[PDB]
Symmetry: D2
């Protein structure tokens, strides 16, 4: 019955979220460049797309048609350029901000009318501990800016769409074991100082993050909107 | 199998949380001055106590004995003195801070060893939108101070007990329909300006708040600790 | 002796900041489309530019040449498209994000080497109460997103440039009497609900905001960096 | 002309603040157990008191009489019990909360009428990075709770007293070189992991913190109230 679109649903956190939603009985479509294999394994509809180039409006239209509706949107598609501000080019800055922020806006804007028609919707953007900090030993100014910007977008859309039955929140994972953060794990000068600040003493498994994502995509969030929810093993609280 | 103690479990939010936990299969004990009737209706163990006077350590000991263990602690017992700072006496200030904050510390401190023995625990303190604001048109300086203090306590205990398998979080409800907030609802100069700032356009039902409380008292919060989670219909985001 | 560039220095807050810096003995250059008259009145160097189109790098180069150095950067140039998310076009979204955020990054990136050479620098971005909220009754999703994004950029640049002697902060004014907010003041449904939330009971004068801006552009901020400083008459605290 | 009372004014940050206020032409009184020597060196009026036992109301009365008025209140008196929550006794918990929080409330409550009579006042509470975190490797749950509670009190009093001409803020210093933090500096396992997170790469000198305190005790803060201002060398932003 609930129809969901998960971008970045072929790997890591996005895949875990798609998995959790399927487990809840949702009909799910995953979008990535080569989603076929993961979709078949997952029991989801594959929607091939390059979100760094393709019109987000088109993906939402394809999702609506493929699923027979659209109630949930999760934007997990990931990219990054880990360079200090003085080294980063404007092109690289825009590449990161476009996929993380602009596409978030465009996807949500396109999906909202469908959720409104159903009188129920859930938009879940993915933030980071960098929504509240600058990444510590890691040089990620563009990413930090984009993930913090998402909290403003979250509040803004939540405010405007609340009466339409749509809830908009920002899931902020801590340090999770996925391919995206391999560079962090392979550099002791990055991994050790960071992990020393995680009270639980370990990084998260994608499925542990997805447990909370599912909640934010369900009836549990009926009165929860315009908020960031950090699932970081205690990192920010340290 | 999971054993839970819910103070303030005979009415409002606390009762709704106790209800939600029983629905999850948890064995629950509710503590309030006259919990008998609610406990029988709820399917919970009654633990009569006046938390404004009785040693919190004693209540935890009684809960452990009554339930055959203790994995979850929810402190919802409520009181307030709605007077401006210049009118408030030190006694009144202490009355509010004691029940909301000191008792939170004492209950958690007493419960932690039991959760640690089990290798799994959940502590849920109850915050407020006043954990982030001063209550707007309502004169509640002591309450605001206590609910904000709880976020510091939440971070502190989460940091220290993470390795013991205990998660500590602060559920921050927005404006909820309970007896505690009747004064707000019966004064147009309070109710209208506040409600105009709630994007969803309505106050919450206790059960809607409890849906999230249950999550924070379950496996969904395995990697979620030291955080405030606001369930306010968009109020803070407005 | 300290050389400062203030974009948006011909009117409102930017003009007040330029004024305050000149009062501190700083040599100031103001940038706007037609800065001549204000510059002459102010005792500042005029730098004509259209920051919605002209390469930010070029403006910084011109400022360095005009002032004989560059130690302080204040980005106050303003624009907005007050339309709800579902009405806003991607072009309009980009127009707001470009001037408020992208240009902030580009200007700071270009100015940093000059501040580093001097071993002392101050970057002051201008945030808003929308860095922490969604603007309440005002439909400003793009602006909210940009002003919140600036806090991430502030933290990121502050972290990377601290050792170079540069401090980076975000001054977040509340509701100020300038031409930019005239639309808010001329609509009772906007002005009254907002002002009712300002404890001081009145909007700010640009010079009152500039008093704090000057501090963040001086030696007082030697150990203050990567922070937002809200000057809002108590609005956020309400 | 402006009269100020600085508790904890004989050493460290409090002394530096008293010094900065005297430099601004304020008539200052410092309160500590043995303030005589520092007061004479400082050019301030000594007010002997043990704030862990003596009625705060009495100190304010003595300050009013000694200074011929009272416009500014800075509460820097310090104490701490660095023990984990499970080791900490309720007495120790109360000792920390009383001096840091209860006394802050009592002093401000007593001073407000004097500031109101003058139509101008400044209350400056002292927070910490633990107003936003749990202290990292340092076991300070009571202190963390108290310093976070102060932000709630700050917002609450700022809201209620804004119309009286009083501004109330929370100065949150990072890691400062004073006797109070010697234990941190003498333990490599504490000092190194903490300092590695300070972008500026060094701890602050008390006078650097006082530069900002003075601003919050002056006309610069005319429109700044109910806020925390962190002066931490970039620690929180890291
Ligand atoms: N890994 C972490 O520790 C961590 C922490 C906080 C936030 N996040 C956020 O979580 C989200 C998921 O990241 P992850 O770690 O699971 O990454 P991942 O590398 O495991 O997965 C990235 C997904 O995005 C997809 N993708 C990449 N480029 C794409 C494109 N051009 N078009 C469509 N899809 C594309 C991939 O195919 C994949 O399905 C991101 O928004 C990321 O910034 C991750
Ligand atoms: N109602 C709201 O809108 C709202 C919003 C944010 C936070 N909260 C918080 O939620 C919690 C619950 O409040 P609520 O609105 O459900 O209140 P409520 O009046 O509905 O219930 C209060 C509970 O505390 C109990 N209680 C009162 N005094 C007690 C004592 N001395 N010893 C033991 N138990 C005692 C009552 O018997 C009852 O079970 C509180 O911590 C409150 O501050 C409420
Ligand atoms: N007015 C408020 O209540 C308020 C509140 C919070 C934040 N702010 C922020 O403060 C800053 C200043 O706004 P303000 O209210 O003083 O506005 P303003 O209208 O008074 O001044 C705007 C300045 O930007 C300049 N400008 C506009 N377009 C430009 C362009 N294309 N190129 C170069 N300069 C251009 C103007 O010429 C002028 O000097 C902005 O960043 C704004 O978002 C304002
Ligand atoms: N040192 C830091 O790195 C740091 C960081 C953040 C916040 N703070 C806060 O700054 C404030 C000042 O601390 P500090 O580091 O300058 O400490 P300090 O040890 O240098 O000075 C403490 C002051 O409090 C006084 N004092 C102690 N007990 C007293 C009592 N019973 N009655 C009256 N006065 C008493 C002392 O005599 C002294 O003047 C405190 O509120 C502290 O928690 C300090």
């Amino acid at each position: 019955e609930r129809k969901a679109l998960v971008t970045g649903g072929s790997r890591g956190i996005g895949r875990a979220i798609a998995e959790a939603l399927v487990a809840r009985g949702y009909r799910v479509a995953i979008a990535s460049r080569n989603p076929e294999e993961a979709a078949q394994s997952l029991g989801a509809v594959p929607l091939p797309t390059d979100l760094e180039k393709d019109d987000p409006k088109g993906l939402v239209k394809r999702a609506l048609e493929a699923l027979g509706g659209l109630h949930v949107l999760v934007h997990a598609a990931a990219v990054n350029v880990r360079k200090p501000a003085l080294e980063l080019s404007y092109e690289e800055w825009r590449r990161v901000l476009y996929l993380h922020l602009d596409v978030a806006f465009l996807l949500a804007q396109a999906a909202a009318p469908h959720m409104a028609e159903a009188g129920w919707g859930r938009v879940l953007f993915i933030g980071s501990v960098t929504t509240f900090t600058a990444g510590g030993p890691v040089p990620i100014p563009a990413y930090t800016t984009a993930k913090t910007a998402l909290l403003g977008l979250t509040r803004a859309l939540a405010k405007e769409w609340a009466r339409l039955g749509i809830r908009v929140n920002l899931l902020c994972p801590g340090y999770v074991e996925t391919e995206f953060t391999l560079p962090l794990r392979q550099n002791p000068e990055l991994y050790e100082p960071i992990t020393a600040r995680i009270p639980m003493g370990r990084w998260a498994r994608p499925e542990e993050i997805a447990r909370v994502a599912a909640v934010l995509c369900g009836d549990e969030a009926e009165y929860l909107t315009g908020q960031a929810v950090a699932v970081d093993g205690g990192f920010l609280a340290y």
